[model samples]
Target: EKPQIIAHIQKGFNYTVFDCKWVPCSAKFVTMGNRGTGVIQLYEIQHGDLKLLREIEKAKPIKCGTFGATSLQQRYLATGDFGGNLHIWNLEAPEMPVYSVKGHKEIINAIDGIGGLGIGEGAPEIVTGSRDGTVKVWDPRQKDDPVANMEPVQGENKRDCWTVAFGNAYNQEERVVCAGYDNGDIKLFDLRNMALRWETNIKNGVCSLEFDRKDISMNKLVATSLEGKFHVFDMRTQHPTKGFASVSEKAHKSTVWQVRHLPQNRELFLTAGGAGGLHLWKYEYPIQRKDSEGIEMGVAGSVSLLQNVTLSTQPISSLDWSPDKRGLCVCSSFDQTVRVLIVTK
Candidate 1:
């Protein structure tokens, strides 16, 4: 079973939906845009109605934003912008942003947090990908510099990386970051040694990549690309080559802009496209038997299918699932509308 749009809102937005994100502890989320206006629009859902909570502005055009995943005490929203600047805004005090850092050299495409207890400990670091072909990691407590810096493989050109995400928690394995670039390349970086571990070139420019939830060892990722293709890969496999199960849907005749794994559900995921709509996908894996060592073995194969839909009628630039609500998602698009959809399975 998939979902249906249960609620929506069409006011208080005058630009494209560059990105949208959910706050970890509240019934609220925020959306940003590319007009170089530097405004972050906040919305709260009360009794199934979307109400504008606050609007914040930075000195640059905002690209992406996310709440502190690992730190529950954090009321700060981290935003990356077109001018290669990162801002940490205090939601409790809307008028004044507490931390502003310049790290990237071009447009900051995406931002994410890693490492703590629930979402991953420590002070909760921020990772940003930029059009300058660099990914930088920052510690909010340090006002000076980035803790880690990553680039493409030695011989590869800067591919205008569109999105970046961290792998699941592992003690023996180094933290792996999967980044999608404009030239249809996805590279995985090992943060422990600050090295490029693996890279895969696809048929289209990659836009988004997301790993499974924190609890499971599924080791799976789904990526959307400009060639109107969506791909899923198994991360646990040892082979260097990629074995993917894909879904090509006419739901988006243009570029498949973004894909995200549902936070609460392991088998379900969502994709946003340039043709304007949200397509729900479900991956089916065959039943498998365990080995003598108690390890689950792989079976014949798996297949992906398009299961449901949500029509947005504009370029859905980026979409996010609510961290606190199951079957709830927020979408931003070129139609200049930020919508809240409650999907019922």
Candidate 2:
């Protein structure tokens, strides 16, 4: 057999499950959602069943969250809500946020962090993308004002930001913020230089973006779109004209909701679909990747679909692989359920 994507546990919620992430020090995981109000339910698995450890209430509907950009001992969770507020919470004390601020004018759609949980390098920073056409990067050491802000220029068309990610965190001085928009725009902002490094349009709304490994230098970037197609861009070389080359493939037949690279293995990844489907993929690099220009001309890599499964009838919203444990993963869906999965590879 190739591999197994088995549902180890499935739990239902009264509202949609927007995001789910595992804690670093334990099997405890956090679930973010909203019905009449927002809530964060931190649960730990006992034997085989999940045990609720703590539940925190909020004033607005919680949208997305990440454990990135903080230390393992700190394990701070910064979450974005419907009211465009960002709150970093200390799970030990669920009463108030350690740092809270109004990050955007509209709903925040995506949130990512780096330099925490033994992942990535340099100062831990968090990036948030919102419907207000802005992406801001924040340092946990600072408050109120973000360290960097990416907004549209005057007289320029504004597009709703859909997703964001961090990569190229090989050192303290190098970091990049890759962002996607509803208008099919893909832009990479260099935090160190405070400039727009690369920009392109895929002709369809960009749904999600992720780098293979953050701690290393730029490697491969996978961008999934609303039309069931995804592109794997080779980041080793950038041609003077072509930029980074990429290969695209289609499988889900619907909007590719989210793409999450495995924590232990970067080349292995999972893609969620709006039609309640999931696909496992692997990227293979070519040997002779160079051209006459001596830069590989941004030659691309090949991706193969390894496995496919249908878990829910509704769209799968998000999923996260466990940081320390291998093959342990969690997924959230529009079906109002969260499922813990174990993959045998």
Candidate 3:
């Protein structure tokens, strides 16, 4: 049987919303965006109604954020702003940021973190990708400088980085950073070994990148692009030379802005499109998984559309499913609307 997705609560805003993430282990969540000024609001759900608890303002618009790196006791929000800076704040004491750093020359477009709140078993690190054409990794314990940085040389062409994510941190010795660029290039940087693990082109500007789960063994990744295409890469058994084997599908009429795999079930995912659509999909693993290139390539999974709904006037930019509540999710749209969705069994 297929899944059913419904917008349970819809809240409109005068300013555009760029990202929204659930507060770890709580019904409350936070949204990042800009109206006249950059704004971050803490919200809770009351009888399926949207509740506003606290609001913070900044000089520059905040583009992206996450609670993945913060523990339940200290829910420090790590966020990227339009001024190309990174900031971590304790929402309770709203006076000043607990952590702040200037890392990029241009606007920061993406951010991901691991090894916090027992999510991953290594050092707590935050990775950021920027329009300045570089990706940097930071350990908040350390000072202002990044521990690892990936950028083009002086003579090489630099592509605007649109998205960045951390994956494959199953152990302390293993950590990877995946970044997507406007020129359709996706690069995986191995932070543990300090090398370029893999690089490939998708033939369209990659709008978003995500790993199904961060703390698990090397597994699957989904990349959504501007050419109405989305690809699922199977990394369960990657070849040393061949990298990853993926299955691609053109699913949208326009650019796809965001994607989130279900926190409870990685096989079920939701994709949002620029044409105002929420496409729910499920990945069916192949019967013969160990089976890969010239008799050496890895097996690829098939994708099926479960349900779709076009509710917004523009793309849903960012979304996060509540880790505490299964099937309960929140998404922010380009048309200045943030919605709470309930996915039924």
Candidate 4:
């Protein structure tokens, strides 16, 4: 199956899309872009189309953004801008942000919020990655200081982080914060311990990285680099002694920008490229299982490319799937419009 463009809306801004997200429960969503001005546009999806919802004028240019995990219930929108400021907006009353706080020393590039990690659901939390070479976790209720922050203690340039994600990767009580940096480094920090657990250097600046959730055994990762290369690693087995075997895809003609897991099918994911397209990849895992001691086991599942398709005409800046809908994905591009599509067989 591939993503087919079902709807397209043009005519709005004259700049690149910095971020886009689907509102949690409603048919509406919001997209933000940099227009050389300090204002952001919110687009609402109605009847499978994009409507000009509202314009929020900030004190600085917006860099990246995300909706609160409680957006449907609270109508809150969080945006991080070039001024190192983060704004929390109450969308129902589009006049101004309800809470504005200083967050980073540099532009914040990515933002994510989680209601919970697929377990017993809890309160919502927010995380952000900044160009200042750090990732910070914040509680929307209290913004005086971050709950936790991760940065390199010793490094040359301190590898500016470009993207960050949070997931329950280990025991049930804890969560893991994984980030990719401009210096080709990927690190996973434990939120419970407030310390770095693992770090590795890749071939290029890790523009994006996503963990596999459908297949627990794979514990695999997909990361895109700056040199038009994409890598897949088996984190469950890869170690310093065993060494990881990563398969590279010289598929994109330009730099890869982002990769996201399919909301409906976690075994599948989508990768965005600088060449203005998105590729859907399906990861197949092995069937065999064995104990710590070597023993007879079935053959490992095959790992290879599945399918790819061009999703847009301009470079895609950000993408998000409808958390409640299957086969529905919205992508924002430099094309100045956000397109909604559905994947079909």
Model 1 scores a TM of: 0.87
> Taking the tens digit of each residue's C-alpha lDDT, what string does model 1 give over 1-345?
435655465544776568888877678888886445777888888877778888776667788887743467766778888898888887768576677877888999988876633665234677889999988888777786888878856797775878888775454344666788888888877766777667778767888887866334436777777756777775555333433333343445678888878888777887787766677777675553144665443333454545545466677788888878787788888888877777677
List residue ranges in candidate 4 displaced over 4 A.
1-12, 116-122, 154-156, 169-172, 214-218, 237-246, 289-304
Clashing pairs in 2: 69-114
Find the candidate with the highest lDDT and give its number: 3
Q: Residues 307-343, candidate 4, lDDT per residue (tens digit)?
A: 5667567777787878777768788888776777676
Q: What is the alpha-carbon RMSD of candidate 4 to the true structure? A: 3.7
User: What are the TM-scores, per candidate, against the unseen true structure?
Assistant: 0.87, 0.96, 0.96, 0.85
> Model 2 over residues 50-82: C-alpha lDDT tens digits?
887888888888999998866777787889999
Clashes of 1: 5
Better of 2 and 4 by lDDT: 2
CA deviation > 4 Å runs, candidate 2: 290-296
lDDT of 2 at 327: 90
Cα-based lDDT for every prediction? 0.72, 0.88, 0.88, 0.70
Checking candidate 1 for backbone clashes, the offending pairs are 115-120, 115-121, 116-120, 116-121, 117-121
Give the Cα error of residue 218 in candidate 1, in Å: 6.3
